[PDB]
Copies of this chain bind each other. A is one copy, B any other.
Amino acid sequence: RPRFSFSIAAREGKARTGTIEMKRGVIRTPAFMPVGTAATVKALKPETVRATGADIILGNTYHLMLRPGAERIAKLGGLHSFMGWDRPILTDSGGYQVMSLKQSEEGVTFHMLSPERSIEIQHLLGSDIVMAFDECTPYPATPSRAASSMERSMRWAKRSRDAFDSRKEQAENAALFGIQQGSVFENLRQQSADALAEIGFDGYAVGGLAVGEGQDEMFRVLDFSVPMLPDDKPHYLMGVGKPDDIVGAVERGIDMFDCVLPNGQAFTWDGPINIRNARFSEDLKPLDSECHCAVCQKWSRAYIHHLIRAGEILGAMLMTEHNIAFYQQLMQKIRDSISEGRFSQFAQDFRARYFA
């Protein structure tokens, strides 16, 4: 395989379906990327993650630089070897989680992160898709503050790019994505998009959303922001999100998603359910009537209700496998409907039923 190749197989409106080819594997797009806690996808063996249909997962840079340490993981052979996932890994750059838990143009101490260190840590982990080091601008933000933050991020983006390119092995085997900022302001989004295209990246993320503004406002910003990005590269909406968020974002040109979202909340095609609710204590149906996951093949709502109420580890295991598989099934239905030119109908159908 090549280091990085994104190809678009089919389109419908702003929506696209295609593939990202990387040395460690292929990523079908639009993609959902399950997120790790600490060199693990919570309560799942990698084989199980893969069985749900995931093509790529997210590494947790912020936690790993802290424990076990990026340098220790590198010594040990890299994240892939360490956790036993041999497919692509995306790593965020760490500042989002820092501010989420001393800032300056050099970076952030909390103990220290700058564009250079962030890129180096992601290299030590052996990430396939490296995110630029950015500032995720708080919401709401005044235009002055948003512009100031955006500008710093773009400077940081240039520094990320140079750092990455400076390291031969990283540059030859990994990909680098830039992250657009600008809060909810179109001119700032445009300035950010332009800055990033000028530097040039393998992919473009839309940063600073999913931070309290709500779906209506997120969709509004996506409406003008995603077309600002290079059409011919992947578009990643960081931190999104619920099923309905994903569908709308794909309608607006987004190709990649991560969220910690997929406790007793189970996703179903009739909307989410909380399996702790007493109404499931004797319900012998699976979590969802149509889901093809192994959980839904073998265990009832009543059983999983018991496990979660009882605080049992198997309950977390089963709920997590189901929910990550539900997300992959969602993505698969999205990919298929776009390929077949019936994605707008799928979205309408999905929403009618999910919100009935």
**Chain A interface, >50% SS class:** loop
How many copies of this chain does the complex contain?
2
| CB neighbours of A312 from chain B (8 A) | 37-38, 40, 42
Size bin of chain A's contact surface:
20 to 34
| CB neighbours of A83 from chain B (8 A) | 303
Known interface pairs A76-B300, A82-B303, A303-B82; A313-B282 also in contact (CB < 8 Å): no
The docked-state distance in angstroms from the alpha carbon of A77 to that of B300 is 11
| CB neighbours of A310 from chain B (8 A) | 37-38, 67
> Counting CB contacts under 8 A, is A139 at the interface?
no
Select the residue from A84, A284, A314 with max chain B CB neighbours within 10 A.
A314
Known interface pairs A76-B300, A302-B76, A317-B313; A40-B282 also in contact (CB < 8 Å): no
Flag if B281 contacts A68 (CB, 8 Å): yes
Chain A residues within 8 Å of B, Cβ to Cβ? 37-40, 42-45, 67-68, 72, 75-77, 82-84, 281-282, 284, 298-300, 302-303, 306-307, 309-310, 312-314, 316-317
Having A42-B312, A67-B310, A72-B281, one finds 8 other A-B pairs with CB under 8 Å, namely A37-B312, A42-B313, A44-B314, A67-B306, A72-B282, A83-B303, A313-B313, A313-B317
